[PDB]
């Protein structure tokens, strides 16, 4: 008795049959083959699975795909512009060396995407608190803060 | 799309196909049984030969829908489950009956049927018996030997040299 869901992921319609117990992260990775999102834990701490879902940052390992029925999700694959151009965040993470192994990066960028909508001009304390749901093993966060600041400057220069 | 159910290499298959889908493309593109090959567009080469309800069929000259309910064997279906190659597969290797390998699935599938038709064929019967299968590499001589080898294997006794 799989459930039929319909939702939008990265601006595209998705329809699927899922077991209710399928975690959203697995739906995204395993069924949708959007393997940017990552699993880093089994307790909802790490944020590697973060996606932007109806204007929220969500840990997709702590949601069933059926809960995302009707949702609009952006994953990391959805961040670059249609012409390929990196988002400000993606660019900032590269420019500022905000990643190393890259494993937290999708979740970090997805969280940051929402952070900079919540607060386009965050202080460092606001950034750090604002990414508190996302663990990184490699970077010690310092360059991630820089990356987010860089991105904010780029964004804030666009208009 | 048309709904078909059939058996391929002993396994049930159920699929939806467009009517115009050639069997070769259903096998290759939808079933991912890419042993069978396409060598021509005029039904001469036999590279697409599969064994289908006890017949050798050029699967480029049949639509998948025509195979509804059929039992097909493709080259992937020839080796034993224990990994042991069929007599033909072995004979083709032993006798150097292939080079590029492109005709080989069709040659073996044809030959599988040939040897059921005629378990102990003469050379002339072999050559005629594979007339629907072109090979560019071998000049056929070793293919004949391969088939002879396979027949002798199957039969437990040699026939011609």
């Amino acid at each position: 008795a799989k459930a039929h869901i319909e939702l939008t992921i990265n601006g595209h319609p998705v329809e699927a049959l899922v077991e209710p117990r399928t975690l959203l992260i697995h739906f995204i990775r395993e069924q949708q083959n959007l393997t940017g999102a990552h699993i880093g834990c089994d307790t909802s701490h790490c944020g590697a699975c973060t996606v932007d879902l109806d204007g929220m940052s969500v840990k997709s390992c702590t949601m069933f795909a059926v809960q995302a029925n009707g949702a609009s999700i952006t994953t990391i694959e959805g961040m670059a512009a249609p012409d390929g151009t990196l988002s400000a965040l993606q660019e900032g993470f590269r420019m500022m060396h905000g990643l190393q192994c890259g494993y937290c990066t999708p979740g970090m960028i997805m969280r940051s995407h929402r952070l900079l909508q919540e607060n386009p001009s965050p202080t460092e304390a606001e950034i750090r608190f604002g990414i508190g749901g996302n663990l990184c093993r490699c970077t010690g966060y310092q360059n991630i803060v820089k990356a987010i600041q860089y991105a904010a400057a780029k964004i804030n220069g666009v208009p | 799309k048309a709904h078909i159910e059939l058996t391929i290499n002993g396994h049930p298959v159920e699929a939806l196909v467009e009517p115009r889908t050639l069997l070769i493309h259903f096998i290759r593109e939808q079933q991912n049984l890419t042993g069978a090959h396409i060598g021509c567009d005029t039904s001469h080469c036999g590279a697409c030969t599969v064994d289908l309800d006890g017949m050798s069929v050029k699967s480029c000259t049949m639509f998948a829908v025509q195979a509804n309910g059929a039992s097909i064997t493709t080259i992937e279906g020839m080796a034993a489950p224990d990994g042991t190659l069929s007599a033909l597969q072995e004979g083709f290797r032993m006798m150097h009956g292939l080079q590029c390998g492109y005709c080989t699935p069709g040659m073996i599938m044809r030959s599988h049927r040939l040897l059921q038709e005629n378990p102990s064929p003469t050379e002339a019967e072999i050559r005629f018996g594979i007339g629907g299968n072109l090979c560019r590499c071998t000049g056929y001589q070793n293919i004949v030997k391969a088939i002879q080898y396979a027949a002798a294997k199957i039969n437990g006794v040699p026939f011609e040299e």
Binding site: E19, R21, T22, H26, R29, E30, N33, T35, G36, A37, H38, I39, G40, C41, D42, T43, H45, C46, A48, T75, I76, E77, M79, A80, L86, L89, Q90, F93, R94, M95, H97, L99, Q100, C101, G102, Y103, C104, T105, P106, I109, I127, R128, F129, I131, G132, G133, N134, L135, C136, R137, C138, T139, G140, Y141, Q142, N143, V145 | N32, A79, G83
Partner: protein
């Protein structure tokens, strides 16, 4: 041309980031192959028990389950144990008994990980409890339980006699008699037992693989989280019977390793066996709780550490004995001759006449490991031992511990310095770095501030205490010379192969394997400089054992020492051939040519030149008749010595004695790793390692209770700092090249952890030193620091 080169020293932005920022990395769990199944383990609920029965019937009967392997399946293949790097064996699936909680008991292979998880729950294991051993200090008591029955009637293991069934090895080095003599007469003997508690590298990606036996071809492909994929290939060959040319190991992108991903785990072996049995691919991906509780732990050394000194603070000797808790199987990664790694760097940065080190390893009912988590083969422990001992000695001497260090540093002119436990340090300028550090942090001013704050505390004017942590450390990285460094008999070289294409771009591969350290960026910078070829015209690959030259992998901060060297050497082989081509083209002797960034010029006729680009083309287009066409080279680099980067780290820590909550005020990290290939990357490496050090010192732990339950092995409890907790890092450097390295570059990646933990722990210990707390064992989390203050009477 200048803009494009992006060679050594440039803060070249990383090529990896393009894919990673877009989710187009290729990590193991991203792999999907036709027919691929998923396997995972039934794991032991018991720390120590006989397995009376495993009933797999209900699991096998579950739809979507394809296999349930138990030890009974593996035996026949001689795969119910697997060799370890330490020369022991580790149970793949438990046979007669389980020896640690969460140990692998059966491997269920199913259509997907959801079914596999369901089927795991259906396997029923009957246990007959045995007495659990978790306290290593009791491991060699006469009534200690016999853990390793499988090797019980073998009093000699892979590192000598075992004097007790739970004794793995005893290893000693240094001059015992001389050390003992010094301690017998020294004015001051400063002894403490420093425990470096068990922690775990916890890479954000857990361990995992996809095994695919192609039964038609008789070839195994194995994707996996392998820091040392060629080694894995060879091991898999030796234990499976498949020949190496038919084993294709692929380490793709790896989401951090931190040492966790060096060795083999049961998962890899079971996935392989399962794939061989089933002839379809089998994926195994562990969850975090199993990662933390069943893969390589780090640390777990109990270091009885003594310094002998004069009252004026000259260090005369060090005597250290370690009790090493290895868990149930000795799977402690190390070069084969070094069962306690390079713990014998524990005399540190100081010139001591004599020393002695003894290490006993014991079995306990715990996961295996030990060497992981930026340890550089027990250098974390060594450095902690010495840098804590420096502080406890300084306290006992009533001396400022910076002064004590300065009094004892190895001086720059002493290098290469033969230390008293056998390592010959390559280069170092410790006084300069220490001075730079102290000046930068205003050290003497800090001490005055601290004194004032202490007086304020005693007057009841503040509940905060200030500590100043110092860690001045000598690392030893780059394992290593073939004479003494081998991984199960393969000498610890590494390698590079560089091939220049006709149009002047390059493919280069190395025997290492990045897990985020930026090799794909930085190895190209080495080549770029050497050949004058823009870095972006160079493609770097690692990890595919079919294609990359054989190497020993990435760990022990060895990549730059070994493959970085090989890269430069191979590039220089190309350059030499290019010079010969240039000589041929320009109709001059090779000796008439000089290299000028990207071209050979004719001495005195600088207008007459051939560029590297032209030479690459000529090697294909007009190959000199004396020479082979093409332009490529390989080097397998057997290092002549380790590299010995160093650092001077200072932490100022404020601690609320009422809660135990410590807050880092400032952390300054000076690292000198010789020539710096990419300062941006180094800085990142440092940030990450300092954050680990903060975690280890201040919170992280894996524990076991008296029943052998593993405690805290999830992110509910395992302290991984977020951006909120993680201090800002202030980094600095000096540059003291390695003389023997082709580009003067030393490793660095582990340095920040190695140095950082003692820095933090020293800061905490230092904060409480005026209250006579003694050595406070890590971690320095709030409850523990509260207990310190409670026991000092601070709360009433």
């Amino acid at each position: 041309r200048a803009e494009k080169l992006q060679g050594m020293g440039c803060k070249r932005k990383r090529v990896e980031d393009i894919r990673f920022t877009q989710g187009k990395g290729n990590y193991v769990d991203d792999v999907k192959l036709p027919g691929m199944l998923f396997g995972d383990f039934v794991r032991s609920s018991h720390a120590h028990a006989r397995i009376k029965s495993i009933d797999t019937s209900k699991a096998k009967a579950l739809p979507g389950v394809f296999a349930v392997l138990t030890a009974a399946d593996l035996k026949p293949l001689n795969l119910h144990y697997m060799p370890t790097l330490a020369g022991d064996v580790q149970a793949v699936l438990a046979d007669e008994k389980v020896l640690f909680q969460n140990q692998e008991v059966a491997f269920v292979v199913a259509k997907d990980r959801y079914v596999a998880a369901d089927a795991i729950e259906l396997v029923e294991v009957d246990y007959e409890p045995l007495p659990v051993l978790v306290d290593p200090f009791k491991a060699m008591e006469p009534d200690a339980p016999l853990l390793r029955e499988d090797i019980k009637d073998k009093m000699t293991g892979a590192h000598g006699a075992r004097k007790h069934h739970n004794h793995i090895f005893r290893w000693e080095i240094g001059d015992k008699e001389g050390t003992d003599a010094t301690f017998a007469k020294a004015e001051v003997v400063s002894k403490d037992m420093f425990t470096y508690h068990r922690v775990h590298p916890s890479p954000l990606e857990t361990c995992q693989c996809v095994a695919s036996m192609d039964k038609i071809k008789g070839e195994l492909t194995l994707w996996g989280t392998f820091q040392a994929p060629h080694v894995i290939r060879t091991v898999v060959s030796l234990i499976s019977g498949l020949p190496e040319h038919k084993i294709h190991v692929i380490a793709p992108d790896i989401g951090g390793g931190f040492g966790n991903k060096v060795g083999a785990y049961s998962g890899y072996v079971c996935a392989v066996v399962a794939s061989i049995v089933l002839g379809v691919p089998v994926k195994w991906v562990e969850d975090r709780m199993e990662n933390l509780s069943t893969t390589s732990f780090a640390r777990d050394y109990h270091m009885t550490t003594e310094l002998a000194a004069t009252k004026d603070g000259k260090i005369l000797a060090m005597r250290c004995h370690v009790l090493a808790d290895h868990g149930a199987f000795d799977a402690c990664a190390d070069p084969s001759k070094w069962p306690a790694g390079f713990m014998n760097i524990c005399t540190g940065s100081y010139d001591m006449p004599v020393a002695h080190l003894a290490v006993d390893g014991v079995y306990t009912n715990k996961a295996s490991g030990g060497v992981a988590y930026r340890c550089s083969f027990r250098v974390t422990e060594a450095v902690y031992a010495i840098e804590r001992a420096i502080e406890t000695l300084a306290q006992r001497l009533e001396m400022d511990s910076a002064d004590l260090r300065i009094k004892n540093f190895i001086q720059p002119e002493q290098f290469p310095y033969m230390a008293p436990l056998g390592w010959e340090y390559d280069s170092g300028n410790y006084p300069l770095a220490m001075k730079k550090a102290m000046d930068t942090v205003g050290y003497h001013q800090l001490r005055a501030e601290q004194k004032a704050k202490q007086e304020a505390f005693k007057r009841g004017e503040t509940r905060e205490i200030m500590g100043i942590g110092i860690s001045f450390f000598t690392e030893i990285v780059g394992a290593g010379p073939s004479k003494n460094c081998d991984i199960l008999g393969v000498s610890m070289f590494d390698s590079a192969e560089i091939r220049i294409h006709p149009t002047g771009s390059v493919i280069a591969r190395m025997g290492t394997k990045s897990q985020g350290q930026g090799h794909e960026t930085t190895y190209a910078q080495i080549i770029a400089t050497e050949l004058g070829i823009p870095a972006d015209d160079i493609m770097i690959e690692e990890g595919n054992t079919d294609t990359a030259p054989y190497g020993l992998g990435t760990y022990g901060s060895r990549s730059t020492p070994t493959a970085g060297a090989a890269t430069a050497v191979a590039a220089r082989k190309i350059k030499a051939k290019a010079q010969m081509i240039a000589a041929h083209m320009l109709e001059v002797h090779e000796g008439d040519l000089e290299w000028d960034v990207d071209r050979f010029r004719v001495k005195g006729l600088p207008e007459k030149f051939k560029t590297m680009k032209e030479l690459a083309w000529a090697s294909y287009n007009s190959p000199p008749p004396n020479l082979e066409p093409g332009l490529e080279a390989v080097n397998y680099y057997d290092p002549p010595n380790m590299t010995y980067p160093f650092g001077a780290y200072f932490c100022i820590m404020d601690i609320d004695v009422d809660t135990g909550v410590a807050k880092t005020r400032r952390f300054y990290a000076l690292d000198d790793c010789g020539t710096r290939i990419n300062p941006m990357i180094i800085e990142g490496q440092v940030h990450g390692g300092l954050t680990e050090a903060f975690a280890v010192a201040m919170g992280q732990e894996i524990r076991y209770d008296e029943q052998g339950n593993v405690l805290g092995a999830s992110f509910m409890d395992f302290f991984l700092p977020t951006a909120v907790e993680t201090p800002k890092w202030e980094t600095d450097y000096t540059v003291t090249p390695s003389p023997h390295h082709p580009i003067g570059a030393k490793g660095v990646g582990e340095s920040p952890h190695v140095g950082g933990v003692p820095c933090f722990s020293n800061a905490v210990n230092d904060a409480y030193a005026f209250l006579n707390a003694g050595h406070i064992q890590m971690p320095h989390d709030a409850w523990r620091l509260w207990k310190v203050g409670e026991q000092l009477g601070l709360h009433v």
